[PDB]
DNA sequence: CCACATGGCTGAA
DNA sequence: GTTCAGCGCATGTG
């Protein structure tokens, strides 16, 4: 009676999609399987392998000769020299393992109907808002190409049963809304019916304000077969959680010297964020706030002001640590310790990958609504 | 027009 | 090439 769920994670990062599925699998009587992934960012791949692998033992290895399109910064491709630098290191073994055991295809432009797995149960993806226009472009154009290709070569039953997009709130702005709607029409042409959700992490057992757009799609014949109905997730409001609830005790944190800066009382906004400004601190508004641990915090970003989240504690004002950032995205302590134990990812890079991820319990809630046939 | 609220990019080293 | 401290406005609601 156990149902094997084959998942394919495009732009997988550290695998918040896979983590969410593993977290609910037992309660669904599911067995989650890596059908494939696409991730080219070296530090995300290393971290993905650290978190999700079972019995992987790193060692010095030659990099597989076809692992050629990867990135050290996540934005730009690594040079022929940078590839040489990874070759014959422990780090290479992580990339080789992702290829061999998780079927990482690395670069979306290299994905086609010849290597895209058949009978995928859940296909997850994303794209930047610029991709909506020149007709699509960039990563979304590649997703569209792949869907076109598999549509023509696969039977309908071999095409992914469910698609899930995550994106930022700007996807529904005045400038992007219409073009996003045209993408949904295209998914329709491909045989998928979809539902757009705007969800805030704070409503899914988290102490973080984080509004994300999700487009859950179901293949239209599978909809008929299962009798699946979309759930109204935008009305869900679980009990609030405070920053206080995830903080880790330590006698050796670094506290910021803010003695030079004038401040005010804390004020709570409608979003349950409780903050106070620092005057003459910077000219960058988002950098100038200290947050109260009895409320929720701001959206964790990969870089910049919202990756340096100042909280007021009894011991002083400090940044949320990398561990606390993992917990803030609803990964567990053990996930963080596995990444830390690689000794390959710096503290700022760990925050960077956390800031790019998705709060895990939002995904648990979405995935809890899926229906599969026996 | 106003007040209020909220979330990456890049050049110097 | 890497790294991150320094830096502001885009996109809203009311
Ligand atoms: C915002 S993230 C998503 C992270 C993911 N949701 C998670 O669970 O951590 C988007 C990811 O897509 C990756 N990416 C960008 N261009 C890519 C390409 N051509 N091929 C593969 N991955 C790419 C980036 O490295 C980045 O980690």
GROMACS .gro file of N, CA and C in nm, chain A residues 206-210 242-248 253-256 289-293 295-301 304-313 316-329 336 347-348 350-352 354:
model
  177
  206UNK      N    1   0.567   2.946   1.162
  206UNK     CA    2   0.697   3.011   1.155
  206UNK      C    3   0.699   3.150   1.214
  207UNK      N    4   0.817   3.191   1.261
  207UNK     CA    5   0.838   3.322   1.319
  207UNK      C    6   0.901   3.419   1.218
  208UNK      N    7   0.867   3.401   1.090
  208UNK     CA    8   0.923   3.479   0.982
  208UNK      C    9   0.809   3.533   0.894
  209UNK      N   10   0.812   3.664   0.866
  209UNK     CA   11   0.729   3.723   0.761
  209UNK      C   12   0.794   3.686   0.628
  210UNK      N   13   0.727   3.602   0.550
  210UNK     CA   14   0.780   3.563   0.418
  210UNK      C   15   0.663   3.526   0.327
  242UNK      N   16   0.708   3.288   1.772
  242UNK     CA   17   0.795   3.402   1.797
  242UNK      C   18   0.940   3.368   1.765
  243UNK      N   19   1.019   3.470   1.734
  243UNK     CA   20   1.164   3.451   1.710
  243UNK      C   21   1.230   3.379   1.829
  244UNK      N   22   1.187   3.416   1.949
  244UNK     CA   23   1.231   3.357   2.076
  244UNK      C   24   1.232   3.204   2.074
  245UNK      N   25   1.133   3.146   2.007
  245UNK     CA   26   1.113   3.001   2.003
  245UNK      C   27   1.220   2.923   1.926
  246UNK      N   28   1.297   2.988   1.838
  246UNK     CA   29   1.404   2.919   1.764
  246UNK      C   30   1.547   2.954   1.809
  247UNK      N   31   1.562   3.051   1.899
  247UNK     CA   32   1.695   3.097   1.937
  247UNK      C   33   1.773   2.991   2.013
  248UNK      N   34   1.904   2.990   1.990
  248UNK     CA   35   1.994   2.892   2.047
  248UNK      C   36   2.079   2.960   2.156
  253UNK      N   37   2.842   3.430   2.184
  253UNK     CA   38   2.797   3.510   2.070
  253UNK      C   39   2.871   3.643   2.063
  254UNK      N   40   2.877   3.699   1.943
  254UNK     CA   41   2.931   3.833   1.921
  254UNK      C   42   2.817   3.933   1.926
  255UNK      N   43   2.830   4.035   2.009
  255UNK     CA   44   2.725   4.137   2.021
  255UNK      C   45   2.772   4.264   1.955
  256UNK      N   46   2.677   4.336   1.895
  256UNK     CA   47   2.711   4.455   1.821
  256UNK      C   48   2.722   4.573   1.915
  289UNK      N   49   1.715   4.847   1.127
  289UNK     CA   50   1.619   4.797   1.225
  289UNK      C   51   1.674   4.689   1.315
  290UNK      N   52   1.632   4.694   1.442
  290UNK     CA   53   1.656   4.587   1.537
  290UNK      C   54   1.521   4.524   1.568
  291UNK      N   55   1.516   4.392   1.570
  291UNK     CA   56   1.391   4.321   1.588
  291UNK      C   57   1.375   4.266   1.731
  292UNK      N   58   1.251   4.268   1.778
  292UNK     CA   59   1.214   4.217   1.908
  292UNK      C   60   1.184   4.068   1.896
  293UNK      N   61   1.239   3.989   1.987
  293UNK     CA   62   1.226   3.844   1.976
  293UNK      C   63   1.088   3.790   2.015
  295UNK      N   64   0.814   3.892   1.871
  295UNK     CA   65   0.733   3.896   1.750
  295UNK      C   66   0.795   3.812   1.639
  296UNK      N   67   0.752   3.836   1.516
  296UNK     CA   68   0.815   3.770   1.401
  296UNK      C   69   0.921   3.859   1.337
  297UNK      N   70   1.009   3.797   1.262
  297UNK     CA   71   1.116   3.868   1.198
  297UNK      C   72   1.087   3.893   1.052
  298UNK      N   73   1.182   3.958   0.984
  298UNK     CA   74   1.167   3.990   0.843
  298UNK      C   75   1.202   3.871   0.755
  299UNK      N   76   1.170   3.882   0.627
  299UNK     CA   77   1.211   3.785   0.527
  299UNK      C   78   1.363   3.770   0.525
  300UNK      N   79   1.412   3.647   0.543
  300UNK     CA   80   1.555   3.619   0.530
  300UNK      C   81   1.592   3.621   0.382
  301UNK      N   82   1.683   3.711   0.346
  301UNK     CA   83   1.736   3.715   0.212
  301UNK      C   84   1.871   3.645   0.209
  304UNK      N   85   2.291   4.084   0.187
  304UNK     CA   86   2.249   4.219   0.224
  304UNK      C   87   2.180   4.230   0.359
  305UNK      N   88   2.101   4.337   0.372
  305UNK     CA   89   2.043   4.379   0.498
  305UNK      C   90   1.960   4.268   0.563
  306UNK      N   91   1.874   4.203   0.485
  306UNK     CA   92   1.787   4.100   0.540
  306UNK      C   93   1.855   3.962   0.554
  307UNK      N   94   1.984   3.954   0.528
  307UNK     CA   95   2.063   3.838   0.566
  307UNK      C   96   2.137   3.862   0.697
  308UNK      N   97   2.133   3.986   0.746
  308UNK     CA   98   2.197   4.030   0.870
  308UNK      C   99   2.089   4.080   0.967
  309UNK      N  100   2.015   3.987   1.025
  309UNK     CA  101   1.896   4.020   1.101
  309UNK      C  102   1.934   4.044   1.247
  310UNK      N  103   1.928   4.170   1.290
  310UNK     CA  104   1.964   4.207   1.427
  310UNK      C  105   1.847   4.184   1.521
  311UNK      N  106   1.872   4.107   1.627
  311UNK     CA  107   1.772   4.082   1.730
  311UNK      C  108   1.822   4.132   1.866
  312UNK      N  109   1.729   4.183   1.947
  312UNK     CA  110   1.762   4.228   2.082
  312UNK      C  111   1.741   4.113   2.183
  313UNK      N  112   1.848   4.076   2.252
  313UNK     CA  113   1.841   3.974   2.356
  313UNK      C  114   1.886   4.034   2.489
  316UNK      N  115   2.245   4.139   2.474
  316UNK     CA  116   2.282   4.241   2.376
  316UNK      C  117   2.216   4.217   2.241
  317UNK      N  118   2.248   4.302   2.145
  317UNK     CA  119   2.197   4.289   2.009
  317UNK      C  120   2.298   4.208   1.927
  318UNK      N  121   2.249   4.108   1.855
  318UNK     CA  122   2.334   4.025   1.770
  318UNK      C  123   2.260   3.987   1.644
  319UNK      N  124   2.335   3.937   1.547
  319UNK     CA  125   2.273   3.876   1.428
  319UNK      C  126   2.221   3.735   1.457
  320UNK      N  127   2.113   3.698   1.390
  320UNK     CA  128   2.073   3.558   1.381
  320UNK      C  129   2.188   3.480   1.318
  321UNK      N  130   2.227   3.370   1.382
  321UNK     CA  131   2.340   3.290   1.337
  321UNK      C  132   2.301   3.201   1.220
  322UNK      N  133   2.400   3.142   1.150
  322UNK     CA  134   2.368   3.048   1.044
  322UNK      C  135   2.275   2.935   1.088
  323UNK      N  136   2.302   2.875   1.204
  323UNK     CA  137   2.214   2.770   1.258
  323UNK      C  138   2.071   2.820   1.275
  324UNK      N  139   2.058   2.937   1.337
  324UNK     CA  140   1.927   2.997   1.358
  324UNK      C  141   1.860   3.033   1.225
  325UNK      N  142   1.938   3.070   1.124
  325UNK     CA  143   1.883   3.091   0.989
  325UNK      C  144   1.826   2.963   0.927
  326UNK      N  145   1.894   2.849   0.944
  326UNK     CA  146   1.840   2.719   0.903
  326UNK      C  147   1.708   2.689   0.974
  327UNK      N  148   1.705   2.712   1.105
  327UNK     CA  149   1.582   2.690   1.184
  327UNK      C  150   1.471   2.787   1.140
  328UNK      N  151   1.510   2.909   1.104
  328UNK     CA  152   1.420   3.014   1.053
  328UNK      C  153   1.352   2.975   0.922
  329UNK      N  154   1.419   2.890   0.844
  329UNK     CA  155   1.364   2.836   0.720
  329UNK      C  156   1.301   2.697   0.741
  336UNK      N  157   2.162   2.143   0.954
  336UNK     CA  158   2.268   2.243   0.963
  336UNK      C  159   2.402   2.182   1.000
  347UNK      N  160   3.019   3.060   0.679
  347UNK     CA  161   2.898   3.106   0.749
  347UNK      C  162   2.807   3.192   0.659
  348UNK      N  163   2.865   3.287   0.586
  348UNK     CA  164   2.785   3.369   0.494
  348UNK      C  165   2.724   3.292   0.379
  350UNK      N  166   2.636   2.976   0.399
  350UNK     CA  167   2.528   2.897   0.457
  350UNK      C  168   2.401   2.981   0.472
  351UNK      N  169   2.417   3.108   0.510
  351UNK     CA  170   2.304   3.200   0.515
  351UNK      C  171   2.251   3.228   0.373
  352UNK      N  172   2.342   3.240   0.278
  352UNK     CA  173   2.305   3.262   0.139
  352UNK      C  174   2.214   3.149   0.087
  354UNK      N  175   2.043   2.933   0.273
  354UNK     CA  176   1.920   2.935   0.354
  354UNK      C  177   1.824   3.042   0.302
   0.00000   0.00000   0.00000
